[PDB]
Amino acid sequence: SDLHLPVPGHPIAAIATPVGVGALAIVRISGAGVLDLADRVFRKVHGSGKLAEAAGYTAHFGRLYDGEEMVDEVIALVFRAPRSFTAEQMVEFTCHGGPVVVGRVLRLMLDNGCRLAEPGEFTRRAFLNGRIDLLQAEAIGEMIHARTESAYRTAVSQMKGDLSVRLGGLREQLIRSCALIELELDFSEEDVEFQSRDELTMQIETLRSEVNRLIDSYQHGRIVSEGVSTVIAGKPNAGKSTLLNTLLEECFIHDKTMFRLTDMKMAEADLILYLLDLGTERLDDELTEIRELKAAHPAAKFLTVANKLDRAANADALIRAIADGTGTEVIGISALNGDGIDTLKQHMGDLVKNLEASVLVTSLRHYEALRNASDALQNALELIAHESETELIAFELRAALDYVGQITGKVVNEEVLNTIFDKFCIGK
Amino acid sequence: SDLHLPVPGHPIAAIATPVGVGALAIVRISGAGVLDLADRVFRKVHGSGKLAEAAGYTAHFGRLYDGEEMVDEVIALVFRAPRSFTAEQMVEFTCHGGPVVVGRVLRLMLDNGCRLAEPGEFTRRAFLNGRIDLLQAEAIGEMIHARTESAYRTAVSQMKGDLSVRLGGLREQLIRSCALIELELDFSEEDVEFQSRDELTMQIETLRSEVNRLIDSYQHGRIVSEGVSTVIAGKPNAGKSTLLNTLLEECFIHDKTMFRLTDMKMAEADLILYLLDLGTERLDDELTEIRELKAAHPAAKFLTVANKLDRAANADALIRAIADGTGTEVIGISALNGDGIDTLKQHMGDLVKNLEASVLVTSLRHYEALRNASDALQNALELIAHESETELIAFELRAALDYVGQITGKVVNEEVLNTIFDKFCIGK
Ligand SMILES: Nc1nc2c(ncn2[C@@H]2O[C@H](COP(=O)(O)OP(=O)(O)CP(=O)(O)O)[C@@H](O)[C@H]2O)c(=O)[nH]1
Ligand SMILES: Nc1nc2c(ncn2[C@@H]2O[C@H](COP(=O)(O)OP(=O)(O)CP(=O)(O)O)[C@@H](O)[C@H]2O)c(=O)[nH]1
Ligand SMILES: [Mg+2]
Ligand SMILES: [Mg+2]
């Protein structure tokens, strides 16, 4: 008396809650005959309402047993048909939040038939069984690892599938535009007035500024996703390490904007901070060195940071000097002393303000595939203006559509799937 | 159509799962009209099966809303009458395991009527409403924070209430022994043969070796609970910091035995490690200094650790020398080099093996109250041998019983309750 559920994978197990101490922790398992396996270690307190023959979304209070030995007191939640995260049947034992206990709970599952889950495997299965699309599966991981109000908020928008509905809108627009020329190529004498060429050139143009708008989102969305890549550059003993350490590879947040610190990825960095040992630099007229870097990366925002302000006497004349002979803005700093750092950050968070309500695109795969989508759309657009064969024009619209589908996983790669889900923590 | 449930406290909220990133996290709330409050932020997906009118141990899939804004997609578990951790009605929203998300979920509960839970408040309420006794409430916290197989296993035994049944056994034995003399003090002429004095002296003696056995458990159980307090002592520049750091206040585990490292708590320390700069010590015949410390703490195990074995040439003759002129065992070590540390630990874990199946007592409150219990039992025991008034004898048995009850919370203190539950993490 059952339906057409997706064939479930081998039973897997992992700890779903963070590592550390806490009141509670979750170990979750999913796959084929998972609750039958759970039944063999879980003892319901009262009678013996078998876990396997239980309804979906029902909690059960009891104990996990390793034969004679008690493991913990747990609540066991039963997920049923397609109605669960992985769309296969799963059970999540929520238990006492101790490393030793939770670890011992995991091994009980492993020793009893579960293979340990692989990075992202849970979320992957969600995508693979069609409960989630590749965008939403990306959004889940992004929401967990998010470090900003904006980062979190964007993940929510995407996990809802705001981008996804926006794309399915273009998907069906391309399908409509695609099938117009594919009717011109059935032909044989089929000229039914109501022109094909004019009606389509616009259909492509509507779809192009549609896609181009989304391409511009990345400009901003990248900063939302992974912050502002900032490089601290200087000299031997300018105080780079001491600045990096007091500010917190690893990174900090300030005024709801994330900053990615690092130490070669100089080119392609949004903000360059040049640190010099104020006065104490043995050869000081190396503000040519700081002028050259500013001239070497015009794409970046630049700030000169005069460090060790506490060792230096009259600093106002030295700051003004450096500012003059480089044509940059200079901020006075003491890195070990932590002096005026809050001035530095208030300045740091200023070109990171870039030139409204609308859907964003995070990290470049979506971006890159949207570019190719645009190119093909514009190849097709130009191809009409040059009066070329329908075969070639319809063949670009196919390419465009294939790229758009690429981002929602419509066209699977299973190597793209890996570079995505390898970043995922073991347990979804 | 309801029962006699304990009056529930003000609605509280806290994050129940560890801090960090993970697939899932739990925010839990408990108190008066908690699910009514939950109903005001949680939207069930399908129709509108109100959370308040739902059955116990039933999960509900939906979304948390902050008015118009979505907060997360959650499963909401409903706990009902006395059937929950705190015995009051509670709900645990299990949601996406991101710091930003989980944090935003907590504030939604707080902004909607919940006061933030206090350290241990959840487990305290468990005890206060009588679902758990003070021993079991102690065991819960101990199981979470445990760092050893033994530590964890002992917590399980106690959370079951193994000690608790063992005590309730003495509780009713004292009640029986207490009421025997209290019948002698009703008297007026009541000498009903079947002697009172002989039958009771043994009843006290049975109960005394009963209690004394448990007092001896602490000797061992303390080491199980908080490991072996080990002090690394030396000289200016003997390499104490470098040894401490490579070995890992904070502490390490080795061969299923926990070691508590530290740097005055010299007296009352199980293991003393004396570290000296092998050879390089400017005045070396300061092995008198190391002999004096061994003679100053005979209660401890002692090991001399000859550090910086890598700088020193012929070390075997220097080690043998130090070993001779101090009467201690000497282990050769290089702290930065990490050389023969595994030999040191194999030696460290040797007097930490102390002179079988039976119930243990962890940290001294139980220990101390069991001492007083024994004293009073033995005061009463001696008092019979000295033929003193029944009033005085019955008054010691009362004192004994009161001490035994003290450990299971039978006699509340609410300042003892604080020093216990202040150690607890916010959220049980
Ligand atoms: N007075 C003062 N001294 C500083 C300050 N910052 C660093 N120093 C001194 O200068 C040294 C700089 O060390 P560090 O912070 O590692 O600078 P660095 O540029 O990373 C060294 P490298 O070029 O090798 O990476 C420190 O050892 C410290 O004594 C400061 O803000 N004020
Ligand atoms: N060759 C060698 N040198 C060491 C070793 N351990 C420490 N040193 C050297 O001796 C110094 C000892 O520093 P430290 O480890 O802090 O010893 P300490 O006894 O804690 C210093 P204090 O007495 O001030 O606490 C180090 O700076 C290091 O250069 C070792 O195992 N081998
Ligand atoms: Mg450095
Ligand atoms: Mg030191």
Author numbering:
A (entry chain A), B (entry chain A): 4 to 251, 270 to 284, 305 to 396, 401 to 473
Provide the authors' original text about this structure.
MnmE is an evolutionary conserved G protein found in bacteria, fungi, and humans, which together with the protein GidA catalyzes the formation of a carboxymethylaminomethyl-group (cmnm) at the 5 position of the wobble uridine (U34) of tRNAs reading 2-fold degenerated codons ending with A or G, i.e., tRNAArg(UCU), tRNAGln(UUG), tRNAGlu(UUC), tRNALeu(UAA), and tRNALys(UUU). The crystal structure of MnmE from Thermotoga maritima reveals a three-domain protein consisting of an N-terminal tetrahydrofolate-binding domain, a central helical domain, and a canonical Ras-like G domain inserted into the helical domain. On the basis of the common feature that the G domain cycle is regulated by homodimerization, MnmE has been categorized as G protein activated by nucleotide-dependent dimerization (GAD), together with the signal recognition particle (SRP) and its receptor (SR), the regulator of Ni insertion into hydrogenases HypB, the dynamins, the human guanylate binding protein hGBP1, the chloroplast import receptors Toc33/34, the septins, and the Roc-COR tandem found to be mutated in Parkinson disease. The X-ray structures show MnmE to be a constitutive homodimer where the highly mobile G domains face each other in various orientations but are not in close contact as suggested by the GDP-AlFx structure of the isolated domains.
